[PDB]
Amino acid sequence: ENKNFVISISTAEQRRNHIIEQFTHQNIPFEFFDAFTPSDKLTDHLQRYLPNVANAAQLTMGEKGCLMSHFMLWKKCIDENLDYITLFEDDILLGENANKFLAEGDWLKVRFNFQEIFVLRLETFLMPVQLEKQTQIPPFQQRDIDILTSKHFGTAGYVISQGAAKYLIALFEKLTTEEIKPIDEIMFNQQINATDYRVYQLNPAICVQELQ
């Protein structure tokens, strides 16, 4: 059964073409998942499943749509009883030997217990905090005053075990409106300390986002 899903706006035909080119050349099976966008469909899904998120002013409707798309795919993993599901966003660029990882799953089956709770990142690791130089505040005694700025972890390419799909669905349902944060922050920052939940990183990675 197919394990690879690419989140893509149903009208984003040029992005879909980019995905098709890359995946078909490497003979990697996949399906598109129609992404949630600002719409009655997204609004109704938020109210049905995540009214906490519907009420969260701290997320943009785009960020809510992104969360909803991942969340519905986590649900798909559970509903179809998949050992794992592999999720992409439609701006990823695949590295050369992606087929060995994405067209076959026996390597995962040997390495992981899917009722255990893990996410394996396939995309490049991005530092969530970086130093930026600035101009307003002058240096002192030959030391610069830099600013700490936050960067989002990508959610553009990862494997999630059925265990983790269940965990993240329950987590997002249990969060209060005030506790909601963008999906990348919950998956890859906040929850890194959580006891049974483990995040792994393929290194070197096998894909990267085409944006920034």
Next chain:
Amino acid sequence: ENKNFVISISTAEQRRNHIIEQFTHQNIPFEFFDAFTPSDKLTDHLQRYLPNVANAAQLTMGEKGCLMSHFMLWKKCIDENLDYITLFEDDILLGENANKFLAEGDWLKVRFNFQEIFVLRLETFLMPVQLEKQTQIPPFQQRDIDILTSFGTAGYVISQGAAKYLIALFEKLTTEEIKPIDEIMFNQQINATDYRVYQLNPAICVQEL
């Protein structure tokens, strides 16, 4: 009035002596703050000021004590009406020319508004999440399976504005939102509107093991 406080367990004589040698070597005034350790004192302070932290199973009592020590120093900043306070942990090494930064404040006064909300890190910048190798799960096609694993609160200046902000922030955090103090101050909260975290580069102190 003194601005430099070094958080240190009252019985940690060896650490205290190392701090004394380092600060006095550069004629930097400081005072020790007796760190909270597992005790009735810590328990009662948690209940009085941070009951959501008392209930947070995800922190060790040591991590709770560390948070409590910083929190009480933020309070000290407010109570003594200090423009800023400079907080250290007791396992640090001071760099050269630290006196210009730590025994004098005019450089801060001309660069910052103390009623505004900032923290200036004095300790070396460390990546708050690292890739750790592991041995149990074999690599595949020359790619390792690493674990993502978790900044340092061993050296920073905080404005009175930020002391107020952080006291209120930590009091408002839910049990679910509680994390070790360094994860809040220097990771989670970097995404926050009026809260600005700066980094001296190169830094003027570094943490020892």
